[PDB]
Design an enzyme around this catalytic site. Structure first.
Site, mmCIF file in Angstrom:
data_model
loop_
_atom_site.group_PDB
_atom_site.id
_atom_site.type_symbol
_atom_site.label_atom_id
_atom_site.label_comp_id
_atom_site.label_asym_id
_atom_site.label_seq_id
_atom_site.Cartn_x
_atom_site.Cartn_y
_atom_site.Cartn_z
ATOM 1 N N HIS A 108 0.850 -1.188 0.000
ATOM 2 C CA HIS A 108 0.000 0.000 0.000
ATOM 3 C C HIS A 108 0.886 1.238 0.000
ATOM 4 C CE1 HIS A 108 -3.340 2.652 0.538
ATOM 5 N NE2 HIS A 108 -2.812 3.152 1.639
ATOM 6 N N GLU A 119 -10.065 -4.640 10.633
ATOM 7 C CA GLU A 119 -9.972 -6.092 10.735
ATOM 8 C C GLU A 119 -9.372 -6.537 12.064
ATOM 9 O OE1 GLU A 119 -10.973 -8.452 8.605
ATOM 10 O OE2 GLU A 119 -10.043 -10.208 9.530
#
Ligand SMILES: CCC/C=C\C(=O)SCCNC(=O)CCNC(=O)[C@H](O)C(C)(C)COP(=O)(O)O
Ligand SMILES: CCC/C=C\C(=O)SCCNC(=O)CCNC(=O)[C@H](O)C(C)(C)COP(=O)(O)O
Ligand SMILES: CCC/C=C\C(=O)SCCNC(=O)CCNC(=O)[C@H](O)C(C)(C)COP(=O)(O)O
Ligand SMILES: CCC/C=C\C(=O)SCCNC(=O)CCNC(=O)[C@H](O)C(C)(C)COP(=O)(O)O
Ligand SMILES: CCC/C=C\C(=O)SCCNC(=O)CCNC(=O)[C@H](O)C(C)(C)COP(=O)(O)O
Ligand SMILES: CCC/C=C\C(=O)SCCNC(=O)CCNC(=O)[C@H](O)C(C)(C)COP(=O)(O)O
Lengths: 83, 135, 134, 135, 139, 134, 139, 83, 83, 83, 83, 83
Positions: free
Chosen positions: E47, E61
């Site tokens: 990312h 998450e």
């Protein structure tokens, strides 16, 4: 020899835990782990350096009596007569 | 000796396994193992991205993994934790080199073991290491 | 950490330095690596019990030493020799604090004393030696 | 010949590189390459999880990667897409095996090339393959 | 340390495990988990590689994995499917951070649950989230 | 797909089958693999241009053939030989449709004709041969 | 196919790229992206290995990557940081699915943006989301 | 002292180089570079030990002249002559 | 036809086995298993070709008797005698 | 030979694209790619099979005239006289 | 409807700050960022949620006019002065 | 306050279904799942958002009582009959 056995043992311990030779010299009447922060590997290194410089054999059930400096001096005496 | 016996004998699995074959095994005295190294390894792209050179830390790891398989063949039936390593790194090791790892026993106690290891590419020592394991 | 990226000769899969806390130039360095269960070597080495291979702690002390060198002397360092003692295991969740003091630095080689700590408990203690190249 | 010349010569990078060294190179006639295979590869844990056996598809891939490095040493300065492969897989190939890949030219045209490849572990043919590349 | 407990509690294996230790566990009310964040993770390089910054969805998450730890230890056997996330990303998170995941349950049903989590870095709050879960264990 | 997991002798990093559409037992199989840019071989093979190595399409036809075998005959299959033609490249975003017909099945070996399609455009066409083991 | 365009548009490299193709692009209003879903991805084996089911947070990340493609092609140069996600997970997503990401912009500011995305599998809607982004490009 | 500089030097070099001190007394005429299976960093190690346990300094020029046990004892000896 | 069964068989086996048909006419007495660098699946290939392009079937027992170009022509010949 | 050149060329094409030999036989007056779905690799395979069975050389600028069946027949004629 | 809009705006801030309504209504004229536990992002929350509640679209350069409960209320009522 | 609660509940369903309020108020007595574009999950949405709007906590076995606009309204007013 008393002088020699003595100063070489304190030399080995002043090598492994590296406190000034007199400072370990005095504190023999305590426990290597309870008051001297000595590990399985510190004890093993002392024992190996002893077998090396002293060209001496060591059975390591003796290690249970490896708790104080004077103690290892006595066991080292017994082994340097062991032959 | 078979790479499939090394499966259960040595619990180290895929991403951190540094042994391929067992050349010799003289029990309680000496073992020698083959770790074949290739450019298709993750640490090469991780270590010094431009030029591929495998790190000595993993050569020491492969030496230790040879020591453990040496240990497991007679003292079986107890984790053999690596306690100390005194290592000298001689020459770099590159992809395509077969790393041969010779482990010799110097001492075995109830709860401790001491080893001398040499890692070579050919008969050219590129790593020497005195290893110690606790139990 | 962005500086740590360029300053370290290593990228993602084999980077063991998260941040540098102090930089006593030409004297010492202290670094932090977080140890998380989301790293590959915790699966490969030992599944039934996730333990950090102490060899990677050695590599981390090594990388921190490289950082200390790149910031102390304005250029290739190869770890020549190691002498390590593993006192205590390192598990996931631990913040490894790696402290490098230098003992001898010459034009062609350098020697450092490293110590890895979790909190105030020494887990590994090493002495490392690096050779320099162009 | 050097694994670092294979960096720019062959664009295939870390996770899909199946060549380590160049043993010989006789230009426009024949090349032979060394791919050293180890148990520390992702396809081994992906392919047939219990027993480690490298798939023949990747042996063909390594043969093709040898063909491309053969192609690039004189026809340089044009992507060399693999057009066809007629392959026979003789014997399994396991970790620790050095896979030697011998590529021979049979035909070179403006926009096409045809190759005969043999992959061996030792002088033991484990894969044969007639390859064809377009441009 | 209680990570080996998390390895069986959380079924998620590498590379999708975002819990390292359970600091505290108050059954049926509250859980506090820890995630050490390092630059040696695949999403940091995946990312925006020119700058390492953890994606917020992965903090969500981690919050969900802490919530499922709380569920499985303090509700017989079922599965928990994430139904909704209403998240507020306050501040970025960087390598070297200890990420503290704090779940407080709001409502529990035979078939549903609602939790409210905050993720902290020291005194900083970096994400607030309201999560909702369903059950779908067939057998 | 859960059945595809057990039915294929391969797991995560080298699995090239997403679903089986039709199963004409002892006659033919058709499977679908999605081709996404989030797979490793698109970086290793060629960075400047993400193209699927046709060899993996061969492997996919192979795996689909294995699935066809495990469901047609109630047990080890090793791909003995391949003869492939790569007609068209395959890119990310493509739905590969791999069709395996069998031409000869004996007790000790089997021969299949495979064809990979994106839509109704044949990209690869192969003939594969497998040997059986216990 | 326009994936090589996405590889430069989206800076996210492997293994965190959740866009494969841009079906449609209406500048300053709407984008439709495609994600092929296969079982050969690390999170399927990392998230509940006994059953392959894509984590919803990754569908949210695909929605965010489509949103950033829309931003970068249809707003000079800045960066876009995800500020909030309000998501509704309708139905599970499995390997072999074509996941269609649909972004419609609601509001655009010099310093902020709000988008509304839906992710579909054929006729099925599986996630609805309201996302909000900020700018923090320093230089 | 000459035999006590022998004490110091020979002691630490026998600690490092892993050989018998009797044959060292025999192999004073042994060459580091080719005959003693040495490293250049091995010389760095012995030189750091002399630096630290003799309590006086040596610049790095000394490094070139480290060649043999006679010759390295001579180089450390000429240093302690200045050093 | 005998020489046309030679036509069919020899043609397809020269297509497969990658040798000269002149030396095949010389090497009718060549052994598949050891002399012709064959595979067992190579026999499967030639047998599938005879199956398909002669338009009649052969069970798999035939496989054992595939040995030599004389002998494999003889085995396909005894088949087409029945087959 | 006309019969032979002709039937072997149609045999090669009926091998590579596998349509019944008469069906390709007739459609020679069209283009291999515009009406016969023939690829670079199909043409290359025909050319290689020709160089193999025909033990004939081929320079592949001839391939630009490889567009129809009768065309390759003519170029094959020219090469079988090429010696 | 200054009373409806005014106490519903009090409630909007009490929701976005997750605070008591009495709390923020006591804080008519103290600034957002310094004391009201709010950054640019909660300001985006007020902007969107009020824009949808009271059926407007505020030309959001009016960002410059949102510093407290007072700025927000006055800005909103100036917006529906636009209305 | 049956009128306040009733048209705010109309609005809750118009929000959760993102539908027109007139639309759903026209649909007082048609079931949720079959026609009103809603599953268990939107039912959880109504449950939570109404529980927080009208200052209650519904013993949510009353799940059995939510099938339409009618079931929801009657269930809610029975809940504040509990109140
Ligand atoms: C660059 C990547 C690093 C990554 C991992 C390693 O740690 S790679 C570790 C590299 N291994 C080495 O030992 C490098 C070479 N070292 C030497 O042998 C000494 O420097 C010599 C040549 C003896 C000097 O002689 P002295 O007279 O000054
Ligand atoms: C389990 C797999 C291991 C894989 C890699 C490592 O090597 S992981 C461990 C790396 N090395 C270590 O930290 C182990 C050595 N340290 C210790 O545990 C202590 O020194 C002991 C041995 C307990 C002292 O003995 P005494 O106190 O009875
Ligand atoms: C199991 C994992 C598979 C994964 C990848 C591969 O494709 S591994 C590919 C394995 N390669 C092989 O060729 C296997 C052995 N094949 C043979 O040589 C034939 O079966 C022989 C022994 C000749 C039979 O003789 P015939 O008289 O019946
Ligand atoms: C096993 C762990 C898997 C990893 C992540 C997740 O837990 S869930 C990861 C993906 N998330 C989803 O797709 C969940 C979608 N939710 C639904 O299917 C429905 O809305 C439900 C909640 C069942 C409505 O219930 P109603 O019909 O009684
Ligand atoms: C670029 C890196 C490649 C890496 C792996 C592959 O091999 S990726 C490609 C795998 N094989 C292919 O699909 C290429 C072969 N197919 C074709 O492109 C056509 O048959 C061509 C060659 C254009 C027919 O020629 P004609 O129509 O001028
Ligand atoms: C470059 C790509 C990185 C990957 C994912 C993300 O884009 S963002 C991934 C992590 N997400 C975050 O932490 C964003 C948090 N947002 C904030 O810092 C503040 O709330 C903002 C929005 C700046 C308030 O603005 P106000 O002070 O004018």
């Amino acid at each position: 020899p008393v002088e020699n056995l003595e100063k070489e043992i304190t030399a080995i311990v002043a090598e492994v835990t590296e406190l000034d030779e007199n400072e370990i010299w005095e504190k023999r009447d305590a426990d290597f782990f309870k008051d001297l922060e000595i590990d399985s590997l510190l004890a093993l290194e002392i024992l190996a350096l002893i077998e090396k410089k002293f060209k001496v054999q060591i059975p390591e059930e003796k290690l249970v009596d490896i708790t104080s400096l004077n103690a290892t001096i006595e066991m080292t005496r017994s082994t340097l007569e062991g032959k | 000796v078979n790479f499939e016996e090394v499966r259960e004998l040595v619990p180290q699995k895929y991403p951190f396994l540094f042994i391929d074959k067992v050349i010799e095994l003289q029990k309680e005295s000496r073992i020698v193992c083959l770790k074949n190294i290739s450019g298709n390894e993750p640490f090469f792209a991780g270590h010094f991205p431009d030029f591929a050179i495998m790190p000595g830390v993993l050569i020491v790891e492969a030496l230790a993994q040879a020591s453990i398989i040496l240990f497991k063949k007679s003292f079986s039936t107890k984790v053999f934790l690596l306690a100390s390593a005194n290592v000298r790194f001689s020459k770099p090791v590159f992809p395509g080199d077969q790393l041969i790892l010779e482990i010799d026993i110097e001492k075995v106690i109830s709860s401790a073991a001491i080893v001398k290891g040499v890692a070579k590419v050919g008969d050219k020592v590129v790593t020497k290491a005195t290893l110690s394991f606790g139990v």
